Amino acid sequence: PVAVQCGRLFDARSGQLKGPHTLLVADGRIRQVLPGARVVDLGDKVCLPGWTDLHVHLGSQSSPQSYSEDFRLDPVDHAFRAVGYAEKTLMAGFTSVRDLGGEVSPHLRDAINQGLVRGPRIFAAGKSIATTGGHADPTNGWNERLAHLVGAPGPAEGVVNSVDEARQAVRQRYKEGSDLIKITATGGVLSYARSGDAPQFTVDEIKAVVDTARDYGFRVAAHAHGTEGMKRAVQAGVTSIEHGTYMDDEVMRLMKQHGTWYVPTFYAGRFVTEKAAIDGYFPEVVRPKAARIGALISQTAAKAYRNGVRIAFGTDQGVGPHGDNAREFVYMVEAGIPAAYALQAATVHAAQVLGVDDQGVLEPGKRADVIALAGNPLEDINAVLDVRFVMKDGVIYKQ
Amino acid sequence: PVAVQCGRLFDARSGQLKGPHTLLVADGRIRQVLPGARVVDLGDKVCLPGWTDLHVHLGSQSSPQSYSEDFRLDPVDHAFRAVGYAEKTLMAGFTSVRDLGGEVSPHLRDAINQGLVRGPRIFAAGKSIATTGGHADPTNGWNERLAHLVGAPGPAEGVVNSVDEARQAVRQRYKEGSDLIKITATGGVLSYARSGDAPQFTVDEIKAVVDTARDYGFRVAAHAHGTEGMKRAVQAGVTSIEHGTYMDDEVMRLMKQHGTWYVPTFYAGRFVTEKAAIDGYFPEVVRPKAARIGALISQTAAKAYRNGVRIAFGTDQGVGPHGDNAREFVYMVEAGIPAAYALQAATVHAAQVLGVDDQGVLEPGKRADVIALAGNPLEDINAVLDVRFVMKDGVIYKQ
Amino acid sequence: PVAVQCGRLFDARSGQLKGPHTLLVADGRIRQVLPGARVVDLGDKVCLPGWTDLHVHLGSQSSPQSYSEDFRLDPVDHAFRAVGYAEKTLMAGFTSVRDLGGEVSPHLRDAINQGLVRGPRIFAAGKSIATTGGHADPTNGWNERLAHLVGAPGPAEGVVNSVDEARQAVRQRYKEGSDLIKITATGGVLSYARSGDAPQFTVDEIKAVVDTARDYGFRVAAHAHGTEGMKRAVQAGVTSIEHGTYMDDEVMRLMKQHGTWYVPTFYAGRFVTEKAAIDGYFPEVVRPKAARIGALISQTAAKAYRNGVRIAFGTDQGVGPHGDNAREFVYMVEAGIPAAYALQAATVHAAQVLGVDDQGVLEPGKRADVIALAGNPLEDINAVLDVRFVMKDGVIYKQ
Amino acid sequence: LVRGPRIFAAGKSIATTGGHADPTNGWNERLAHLVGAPGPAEGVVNSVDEARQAVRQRYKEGSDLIKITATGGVLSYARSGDAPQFTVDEIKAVVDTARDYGFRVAAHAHGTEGMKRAVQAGVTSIEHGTYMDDEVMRLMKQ
């Protein structure tokens, strides 16, 4: 039964900064909000709902030695790093994340739920689904000896090639304890492959994936750079599109008609463009793809916003350093997107993408995930980079 | 910035021998051609664009001990032999080749691109795709002990039996780093099998292969002797047909309607018939097939030329000795094909088969691959057997 | 440079409590101790060197569900539990531990050395070496189906049956990044086996293990309950004996002549005796062994101390709850061992057992591991249950 | 086929588990599981009978001489740089088997103890002598 007094309250449902309020928190939920028991005072601070990041990779972080860790490290080391990664992510103001790839994230989610370690609320997609030679193929770039003694990956490993294998892949993701489904619709930038935007899925396989996920109650997110794969994924019926580098007018029309969410991820594109300039940071197979593709994200996102495509907040951290997600807000504001909409996209739209209702707005009966800022973020977006108070589920983690 | 002065220039776009010209080469391209900086003088020479061979096997060469090398040699020995094979091919005037089978050719292409060894520009198809018991099945003729210790080949090994396996095989060829797709539509002569012209593919599987290859920008070439497999491959939508020993009028009509390219390969047809006369050179399973099939190639190619089928230049070297490709120019001319068309088929039509535009004609903005002949090849076709100057991408390899 | 003012100081090299002192810490070591820079004042506290626990299992903890997690849980879950286990162990005043079995411990040591997580300084033995059916056999109690699909363990798994296999086992332990070697000479209480004190090693295998360990700079610790296995291990030349449940006069004489160290581990015996009374806690195979063997660790340790056998400090935590190690100090003092010797056994004798000269005493040039207690432990042995100040390598962790 | 000098090839180098020439040093658990622990066919030995088979397998693969790593090395993915990694019986077995097939033995060594063991076993040449002392020099001269 705590009473949090807030000097200025942000209404994520309306996007307008309100006056002083008081929140009553009991049993991990918000009991009532009163205009104007222990007391937590934030009279000279701005209170907001906890932020949600819809694209993170908490079990990795990009580094010069990243491409050699596949043959030298074990999952235990990745978990020991993910402890600090999750603590840094939680302390930055993000009380919820959607992890879109990795086999360490379900275990970290279980550990956080059991209270062994501190971190945000994780919605884990598990191992991503791809095709042979795809962006998420685990054996791209391996020589013939290792490839032969490791075999050809199949539905149990996440590699699909037919309609009947997609069903088995979705069922195996459900069996391993996933919360949603992730597919790579086209090629990628950071993979050890040749293509970067070629359509790597047929419409039948994506439709099978969506049908199986709907049978199991899952939602499907699709990584996509090229136009043909993006159009195939949109027409199949996926929920969100992870990148839109080569999005055109017809894809925008189809997205608006279907209701697809768009996750721009400015931060990853800026990071790959910056790191492609350093010699030796990326393999020579990867460097041209990054230097070309990554620089065409801010314009497409601005055009999609101007055309009326629903946009959500996601960072693709794991390329960039964890605990620095809030910088994307700045990248949004300097892209033509108003600060109010940028703050809305991480609170009330992220819950719509996630398909839940118990979070996103500071309303009675919802989860008590509250954060505080020293400065007003509407008149100056940089104030999102200094969080002074973090509370999750009624437990204060930063005062 | 080199100036090559040529006494007589051949116009591959028109097929007519022109007068003296001057080519300006800078940065590996042709800058301008002027009728009438270091100077390379070929005053008493005929200048032509570099030749292209659309059917070679640079990782092997036929010999009496060829059929036992499968169990005694390693890929390293084949690479060490290909080192000399590629140089012998380049010095003969062929600055570009299309390799249609072999798992050593992508590595040799990478080595040549990195500048470690000298050779032509390789477009590699990788491992060929076949069916169970097919012409390109890697385990034909093996006893049951070895066949059990190696298992049954699948899509990862290049053997398909359904549409989904065909899709997986094309995707695996893309993953392994291929530039096009090669399928065996019928039986063959040099296989350790029983049939020589039976249809070994169904229309659905070939259509699946063509669709998957089109999804990745690949072109498909088909090896075919019998009429039924040839017709199936033509109707499915392949680009070129590698043989047509039993081509009839309905196939010729279908080829003309669809636009299929024809590669006769006179040299291999003559070589197999000549070597079938020697006792013990070929296995008793192979000798009748060679002695029968190989002798019916020159008549079919002449009839197809008379009927209006588009014909490209290919030799199927690896059966014949490398560095002797130009002899095919003779076999075409003594088959009724004019010398001008024979020279055109290896320069401007080979680029159309390959699907590129930066080579084939000595024009500004195209690659500077130039060769020179001592005698005029139009009046005498034997002059193609004495090349005196070879330059590839602006670098002179033979003066 | 930090100046620590101490009201009373304990000299581990003499076992006497001195007067006020001042310690100068710079670069993570002790510079000068002056009788009588940022100042840390502990004028009303008793300062001691950091304690060392020579028998812990930081990768596990006893639970009613501990006999089904071998088939349900993953090493990542054990790492996430080990983070908290190590933090609790460090906060209790134990700045160094010797881990005597477990696959997670080397990775936890690496993570702590890199600063990713908090914990003590780990000397990890890695896998424990046993024979077929031994106390440390990883497949004890499994059914025929599981034991078939896993195969018979060999020297790579830690199971040996000859001299040449023991050599390979020691070399494999070195290869995996171990600091010492651990073998089980006899049976154990908690194994899924019939025996509790039978000899399971021959003198020729233990001698080979010791000889191979001496090459790589390793020391050998031996688990033993019965008299014959203890005698074999002592005569072979092991460094320390982990339990002495059935030690007799001849074994004590041999230990005195050889100089072997003895680790009683009162806590494990008391815990197993208390948990054997509960119904269903242990499997029916384990319960009689826990009821019988553990009730004799107190009379044997007292007799060994009265006979002049050298005794060190160890708790076997992971059977007991992590963080409660210091309670063993209460068990030794009530067993007849004086408080000063019990305090020396964890500071100056643990360094002799480990073979490191940089720790153990608060002297210039040594590692700055300093702990503080509210009360005087030489008159009340319960004061070791209230640690008020912890410092490891010059960094303050608890103030 | 190609140009170059006259090669006297030793082939695979023989080492022990975790040795300087171990082909699986530094690999993670997954990779090391799908390759198996190297044996005498891969050049890794741990006894006399395994060393005999290793020398015979080197002969079978077309080698001209035998190469062993007596101690640790600088460039390996291992913790040690000069520790003894061969016992005096294994080196003697290697030399005795090599003498049968007409082979000579070269030894990689940095530390003093491994160098001494290799010199007293009867190797032909020593590849490095980083920590050679007076007794090792006297034994080499003798």
Ligand SMILES: [Zn+2]
């Ligand atoms: Zn992506």
Ligand SMILES: [Zn+2]
């Ligand atoms: Zn991603």
Ligand SMILES: [Zn+2]
């Ligand atoms: Zn063919």
Ligand SMILES: [Zn+2]
């Ligand atoms: Zn061919």
Ligand SMILES: [Zn+2]
């Ligand atoms: Zn024990």
Ligand SMILES: [Zn+2]
């Ligand atoms: Zn133990």
Ligand SMILES: [Zn+2]
């Ligand atoms: Zn060396």
